[PDB]
Amino acid sequence: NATEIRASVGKMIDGIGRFYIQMCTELKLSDYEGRLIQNSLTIERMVLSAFDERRNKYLEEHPSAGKDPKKTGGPIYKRVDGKWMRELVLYDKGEIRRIWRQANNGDDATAGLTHMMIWHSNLNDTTYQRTRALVRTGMDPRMCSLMQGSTLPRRSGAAGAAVKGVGTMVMELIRMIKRGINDRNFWRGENGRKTRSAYERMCNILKGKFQTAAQRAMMDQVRESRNPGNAEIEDLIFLARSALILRGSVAHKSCLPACVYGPAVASGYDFEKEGYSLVGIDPFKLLQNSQVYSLIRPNENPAHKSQLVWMACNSAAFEDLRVLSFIRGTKVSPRGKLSTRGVQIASNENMDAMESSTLELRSRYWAIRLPFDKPTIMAAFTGNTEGRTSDMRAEIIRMMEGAGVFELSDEKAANPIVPSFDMSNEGSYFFGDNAEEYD
């Protein structure tokens, strides 16, 4: 049905909220501290860590010597008379798993864990830069607009495949080949047909994201190359360049932090009875009636820190800023022009110099489901005229050289608003990027 899918998604949100409510009490957090997204991020990672048990499926964590492997934790931020202090907590993974299951009526409710994994992915995509991770692979750093989901853990299942961008899959495939060429046994033994089945699916996953017959036909030859080498790497890079113009279709799910679902459940909002959808107005309505706080570093502009959180909640980092600027009712600027840094607080930072602020995650309209940068057409058309030409590579080039919104009062899309884009401002979030690189 279309209403029972809204009910199963609803009970998932309920579980996340009821979980967050419970942990806010066990850690004896204020209501303000409970709505602090920094505490939400820590509470989120811990439960993911409790079920991950060092598989790097729900998250990735760096090892530390002497740390009991059977316990999880993170920094919890608490305030007294306006001064924040970091406190590191340690909980047994087993107990975290029990609280999560108890909050989900006894079920493992793994879909709720992945839900928070996506949110972490969206936030990282919006906060950090992967230009070094691209350059250290042979890819063009100007493919940043293709890297949705590139921070998802190494062993994320098909869960993350849906939101992984063309650029993310291309690199993943390239990496597999680069150690298939520097280790004989990679495709040998059943340890090899282990990785061949994965190579085939990852190829067909990326094939499915392409929406031109020529792009898919060339992925077929990459898939059915019995031993891929530096030849297939070259054409995967070519496909990535074609994806800057003949963009592929990628999922964009609006996953909000637990500090939003948490208080909403305490309000008495039973998401199972009334329903929920990651697509449409419900995620906008949660944020509009939300109240989330965030720590602020000296000289960080609270308005910009709000934008990057709002953009991560809506998974819009890879959309045109002129379009989102009209929806938000305010200019949503490129990352390079944001006078702020990440939401997470490093271990080295001075906590006495930290302030709080209400995040502005509100929008003026909502949406469902413009020329290209010069940086992107330059990257797309730096093809290897140098060397190999082909069949469908020449056709794809030919195709490349050829190249709703509603008011929140409009609850089910009656009067669509024709948009007004101001062509003055840049369209890509990554134009003149200034942000930290991931890890």
Residue numbers in the entry: 21 to 389, 418 to 451, 462 to 497
Please share excerpts from the published article on this structure.
Here, we present the structure of the NP from the A/Northern Territory/60/1968 (H3N2) influenza virus (NT60) and discuss how it differs from previously determined influenza virus NP structures. Despite its ability to bind to and be stabilized by 14-nucleotide RNA, no RNA could be resolved from the crystals produced in its presence. The best-diffracting crystal produced in the absence of RNA gave a maximum resolution of 2.2 Å, with two NPs per asymmetric unit (referred to as chains A and B), in space group P21. The NP structure consists of head and body domains composed primarily of α-helices. Most of the oligomerization loop could not be resolved, with residues 390–417 and 390–437 disordered in chains A and B, respectively. The structure of the NT60 R416A NP is highly similar to other published IAV NP structures, with root-mean-square deviations of 1.2 Å compared with the WSN R416A NP (across 439 pairs), 4.0 Å compared with the WSN NP (across 393 pairs) and 5.5 Å compared with the HK97 NP (across 429 pairs). The major difference between the structure presented here and those previously determined is the position of the 73–90 loop, the deletion of which produces an approximately fivefold decrease in RNA-binding affinity. In the H1N1 R416A structure, residues 82–89 of this loop extend into the putative RNA-binding site, whilst in the H5N1 model these residues are disordered and were not modelled. In chain A of our model we observe that residues 82–89 point away from the RNA-binding groove. We observe that the C-terminus of the NT60 R416A NP folds towards the RNA-binding groove.
